[PDB]
Amino acid sequence: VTEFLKPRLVDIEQVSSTHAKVTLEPLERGFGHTLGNALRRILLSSMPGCAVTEVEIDGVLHEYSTKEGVQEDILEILLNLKGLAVRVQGKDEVILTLNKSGIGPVTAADITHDGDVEIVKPQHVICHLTDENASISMRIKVQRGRGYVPASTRIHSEEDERPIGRLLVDACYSPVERIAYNVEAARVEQRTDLDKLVIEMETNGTIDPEEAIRRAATILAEQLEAFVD
Amino acid sequence: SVTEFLKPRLVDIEQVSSTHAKVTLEPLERGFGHTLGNALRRILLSSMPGCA
Amino acid sequence: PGVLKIVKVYLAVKRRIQPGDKMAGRHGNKGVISKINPIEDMPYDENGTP
Numbered sequence: 001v002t003e004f005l006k007p008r009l010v011d012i013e014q015v016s017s018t019h020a021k022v023t024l025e026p027l028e029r030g031f032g033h034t035l036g037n038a039l040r041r042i043l044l045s046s047m048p049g050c051a052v053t054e055v056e057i058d059g060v061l062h063e064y065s066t067k068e069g070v071q072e073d074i075l076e077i078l079l080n081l082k083g084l085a086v087r088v089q090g091k092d093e094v095i096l097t098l099n100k101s102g103i104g105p106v107t108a109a110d111i112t113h114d115g116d117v118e119i120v121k122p123q124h125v126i127c128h129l130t131d132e133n134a135s136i137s138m139r140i141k142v143q144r145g146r147g148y149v150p151a152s153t154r155i156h157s158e159e160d161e162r163p164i165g166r167l168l169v170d171a172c173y174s175p176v177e178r179i180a181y182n183v184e185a186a187r188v189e190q191r192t193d194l195d196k197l198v199i200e201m202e203t204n205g206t207i208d209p210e211e212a213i214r215r216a217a218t219i220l221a222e223q224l225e226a227f228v229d
Numbered sequence: 230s231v232t233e234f235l236k237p238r239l240v241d242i243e244q245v246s247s248t249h250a251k252v253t254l255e256p257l258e259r260g261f262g263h264t265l266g267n268a269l270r271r272i273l274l275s276s277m278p279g280c281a
Numbered sequence: 282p283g284v285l286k287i288v289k290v291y292l293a294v295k296r297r298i299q300p301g302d303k304m305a306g307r308h309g310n311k312g313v314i315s316k317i318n319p320i321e322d323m324p325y326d327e328n329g330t331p
Contacts, residue, residue, distance in 0.1 A: 002278075030275030034268045040329075041264040041321050048231045064293050146231060150297075180329030200329060219234060223257075223265060226236050260321035 004028050005194055007035070009210060017120070018205035022213070026187055026194035036181025036197045042216040043199075046146050047176030049206050050088035050117070052081065053143035053154070056166040059136065063167060069134020072127040078169050080125040084108065084140065085175065085204050089116035092144040098126065101135035117142065120205050145173030175204030176212065234258055 011023035027035060055078065059067055063074035072080065088094070097112035105128035108119055129136065151170045162168070180200040188194040201209050235256050242252035257265060298314065305311050325331040 028276070030271065034271040034275070037271075038264055038268045040325075041260065044321060045258070045261055045264075046232075046234070062293075144231060178329065180325065215232070219232070223234065223236070223261065226240075227265070227269070229240070260319040264321065 003191070005191065007031070007196070009213065012210060014209065019202045020200075020209045022199050022201060022209055024197055024199070026185075026196040028194060029192075032183040032195035032197045036183050036199070038220065039197075039199060039213075039216070040179045040181045042220050043179035043201065043212065044174075044176050046216075046219065047174045047203070047207055047212060048144060048146045048215075049173050049175040049204065050086060050092070050142050050144045051171045051173050052084050052140050052169070053145075053149075053171060054141045054166060054168045055081075055138070056141070057138040058165075059138075061164050069129065069131040070127055070136065071130045077127045080127060081140070082169065082171070083124050085120060085206060086142070087118040087120065087206050088142065088144060091116040093141070095139055095141050097139040099135070099137040099139075101132070102129055103132050104129065106136070111140075143173075145171065147174050148172050175206035176201075177204055178202035234261070 005026065005028050007025040007027035009022070010025050012020070013022065014020045024035075057074075059070075060074045063078060065074065067074060070077070086096075094114065094116055096114060096117060098108075098110055099112075100106070100110045106126040107122050108124040108126055109122040110126065111119065127136070149171060151168055154168050178201060181197055182200065183195050183197040185193050185195040187196060199213070201212070203209065203212060207215075235258060237255035237257060239255040240252065242250060244250040254262075256262075300315055300317050301313055303311075304314055320331075323331045
């Protein structure tokens with residue numbers, strides 16, 4: 001080591017709720033490249049999250065079919081609503097709900113507010129309505145996954161289940177979506193010129209920047225633990 | 230599950246000579262193994278103590 | 282054709298673009314998408330966007 005000068009988390013700036021630029025302490029030579037690269041890689045690698053996993057909606061029976069009063073297709077509903085992302089508590093595999101009528105635009109806000117989830121933005125799309133008499137009724141099931149789980153990757157889970165009315169779609173299940181490294185060298189006068197690495201992290205807002213960084217670090221440490229042996 | 234990751238169990242290493250040798254590990258995560266190897270090279274080479 | 286009734290059923294399908302399939306360009310170039318790289322692989326811009 002010989003005064004290895006290990007870096008530490010410091011000067012974390014949140015550009016937005018889902019846009020952030022964080023810093024760390026200066027570190028010795030040769031780690032900054034490795035630190036930044038491994039950080040971007042691990043962070044993008046496995047960021048667990050919650051997302052919409054299976055849909056059971058009263059109206060349609062075949063999503064490749066139309067629906068009176070509604071504008072977008074049922075596949076279009078699945079696509080736009082697939083933009084649903086929400087913070088999830090320790091509870092997993094929950095069922096949120098959303099049912100409403102009217103003639104105004106349909107927003108994500110018109111969803112059943114449970115005690116274990118939080119919708120980040122009221123601005124997502126729920127296939128804005130078209131006719132007064134029509135009433136959309138849906139209940140969206142959310143699961144907690146680490147990465148993209150294919151539509152037929154979940155096929156084997158249902159042998160006698162999944163009736164026509166309950167269907168599955170695809171997802172990403174990783175709120176990270178951005179991790180990048182930029183190493184500079186500053187704030188080093190008392191000792192040799194050390195390097196501080198700035199991390200640009202733009203998560204889905206579901207995971208906090210420092211918390212996610214800590215989780216990734218713990219994963220990396222767990223990995224390196226066997227490497228000694 | 231959510232945060233569990235595969236750890237390598239097969240750590241059989243063949244020593245070609247007193248200095249030449251190749252070790253191998255069991256399954257690392259896809260892309261995570263490559264990152265681990267690259268970082269191992271970067272660290273083990275960019276800084277390695279010894280009298281010279 | 283002496284059939285009391287002929288009934289047709291039409292089903293649907295979606296297909297996923299996977300390694301080896303055919304693509305090209307409007308600038309005249311044939312090719313196949315043939316390498317499935319984990320997202321930690323494809324190079325990223327200086328601003329980070331791959």
